[PDB]
Symmetry: C2
Subunit: 218 residues, 2 copies
């Protein structure tokens, strides 16, 4: 597997909120991943080549192939490991399981959970119009949604510390409900029971765009 990254987190955070890459373009280089939509209109979650748009009101909907993204990370998911949990386990305990199995922080990880979540707390960015406010101020204003006792799917990546300028260092995880109508970017969660599948990734492709805003960003 190759982690295929569209653009750079530094470019996104600098104010480059639009790109020309479509959701269909993303699915050329993976069936699994995360990212942001143009104008920061929420975030995407993708697994088994199904893509959904998660928005600031807690909603999820099917992503359309023509929608565009300024930043995303995709892969052809090829997990090496599977662990079933029959009793409650916290996000941080699950990360401890992954980190024991893949202890080098110098590798990436892709992870998926299918199961029943005791709770899943989410906060997702709303669509932005320029001039842009500081991202931290936008996040201060966004409600946290709390999904309680819901079946659903989690998609995530673990990014090395040696990558903080380029991508989201540490764990980045998104959630969607079984009915595919709710979800968001995860702040914390606890799994009541479910199946974790995950694997390490050694290869990263960074595709730098050609739009003028990216080229002129500092």
């Amino acid at each position: 597997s190759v982690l295929y990254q569209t653009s750079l987190m530094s470019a996104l955070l600098s104010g480059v909120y639009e790109g020309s890459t479509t959701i269909a373009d993303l699915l050329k280089h993976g069936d699994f991943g995360l990212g942001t939509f143009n104008e920061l209109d929420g975030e995407l979650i993708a697994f088994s080549s199904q893509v959904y748009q998660l928005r600031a009101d807690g909603s999820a909907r099917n992503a359309q192939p023509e929608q565009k993204t300024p930043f995303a990370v995709m892969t052809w998911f090829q997990p090496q490991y599977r662990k079933t949990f029959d009793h409650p386990v916290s996000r941080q305990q699950l990360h401890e399981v992954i980190d024991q199995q893949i202890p080098s922080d110098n590798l990436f990880c892709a992870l998926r959970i299918d199961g029943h979540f005791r709770h899943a707390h989410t906060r997702t960015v709303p669509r932005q119009t320029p001039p842009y406010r500081a991202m931290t101020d936008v996040l201060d204003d966004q409600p946290v949604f709390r999904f309680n006792q819901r079946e659903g799917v989690l998609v995530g990546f673990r990014t090395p510390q040696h990558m903080q300028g380029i991508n989201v260092a540490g764990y980045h995880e998104h959630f969607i409900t079984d009915d595919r109508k709710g979800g968001g970017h995860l702040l914390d969660y606890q799994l009541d029971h479910g199946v974790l599948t995950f694997g390490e990734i050694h290869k990263l492709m960074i595709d730098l765009p050609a739009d003028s805003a990216f080229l002129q960003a500092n």
Copy 2:
């Protein structure tokens, strides 16, 4: 074109001086590039799929396909631009030509010069045995070799500032003489006349190794 990078500069600088990637492996993903040999036994220069080993005594020799590298950057060279210089031009003037043509620091550049150099000054790392001394102290001790009025070839890359942890930010250029028996890592040069060919690169593949020293490096 894709800039194909073997490992990380941060790993090399941390003391990971050996890898399992061979020169033949490098040529699977390019015909052009630069890098370091195992044990820091000099550096490589590659152009038109010819690879040479440049060592601390100023010498160049044909690189053997079975030799291994802990760090390298390769591409299938596809320049978009050609400029002939009939009168002397300094390294920094040449970089000004490139930077005017490719002004976004957010893109990579690959560059090649074929011509007659007024001078080319080089300093190249010697083979190291552990425990390793600080790289800066090793470089303090290495002689600078001065190639005067020599025909030769220059190979180089320009790396964005948004990449300093991962690769050599700015320009990184190596030189070899026409007889292929002298060369090194360039500190400065002046071209008397010659041909510059160069182009921009938007895609970077990072291939992270699996050897234990890389996995355990901080």
